[PDB]
Symmetry: D2
Subunit: 114 residues, 4 copies
């Protein structure tokens, strides 16, 4: 139900071995750990959650861009990239969060399909 | 020292009346409110801080994209766009945070200059 | 060896049924038709060329964004999106040209892998 | 009436000294040279045309990204970034074409205003 895909705009490649942390917003407005992993050789992280666990709510996907750039010897601007959204059951069932990374910029889009 | 510029990729226009909240990470790891404002008719927000107040630290610029799209009667994907960065750690710099908004996507870039 | 992937930033979806034309730059600097098709239900167009036919050179991928937006009742800015690049044998073998579309903006990236 | 702004996503800076060529489609379908220039220290290019000369038509703004990245000693993916659009077909407008550059990617947006 939730996939993350990360691309590198400097090298023209998937962004491999990027740490990604997913959080769910709790009743008290704090961010509760939900899922995490490292992107694969294709820049993708699957297996984060199941349909049962992925209920409506506000989620935050934090992509550790700073460590990625540092490991390439590049000083980047951001601490991380955060993508914050509501999961809504009225919409399509599968969410892909995509991000395209540069040292001083990032872009993100959602592909929400059935 | 800190300016925010926001564009609308649907309209081909400045994104006007976008609320922006800036936070700074405190010594205890919480996000302290630092400044706020909203974008003008030109999509720009100036006057958030001063050179004196804009000390070294980790800053979070939260651009209230959902509120922007909902005020236009549109149901967008994201809650906000958050831009988190260390500032002024090699001395004072001027930062422009730019964002380009669509209902299911955004991009953001930084222009950092040494005065 | 060549794939095109097109996404819609307004609807959060693949951009389906988008016409895509690929051209190769000829010796006289004109653009010679090379391959074309329409993106699938996943926003992808595969089957454009083969390894034998896809030799080094300058290629142009023209994405008919204007017709896409018109069919959704949206007046867009661009006539099309053009992505122009050199295929180089020294680099990785598989080229994916990705584009993310909005009415007054587009972004494009290359994912070049082995 | 026509301005071009270019940013560098690697450096976090204006993209300076970027060559830009503008073409207009002629009645016979060829691309006629219309104007050209290069971006300033602020990444901006003004003075390409006048209200009188910038008539209705289909325009192509070619941003010479490869030449920019090669002048910096970098091997980029694209030859150029081309922005093709109909202009002034509901009367005169002011157009800003903005581009954000990385070695294997670019984005472009338009801001269109009615004076
Ligand atoms: S696919 O899942 O096989 C595939 C292959 C290559 C690239 C993609 C992809 N997904 N998102 C993007 C993208 C995101 C942004 Cl923010 C900007 C751009 Cl230009 C592309 O590319 C998917
Ligand atoms: S400038 O202040 O004259 C000026 C005018 C129009 C647009 C800009 C501008 N600033 N940033 C951007 C931009 C940001 C992103 Cl994330 C993506 C793109 Cl394509 C452009 O445009 C500045």
């Amino acid at each position: 139900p939730l996939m993350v895909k990360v691309l590198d705009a400097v090298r023209g490649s998937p962004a491999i071995n990027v740490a990604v942390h997913v959080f769910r917003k709790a009743a008290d407005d704090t961010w509760e750990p939900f899922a995490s992993g490292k992107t694969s050789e294709s820049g993708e992280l699957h297996g984060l959650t199941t349909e049962e666990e992925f209920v409506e709510g506000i989620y935050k996907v934090e992509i550790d861009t700073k460590s990625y750039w540092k490991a390439l010897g590049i000083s980047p601007f951001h601490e991380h990239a955060e993508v914050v959204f509501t999961a809504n059951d009225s919409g399509p069932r599968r969410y892909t969060i995509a991000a395209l990374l540069s040292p001083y910029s990032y872009s993100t889009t959602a592909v929400v399909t059935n």
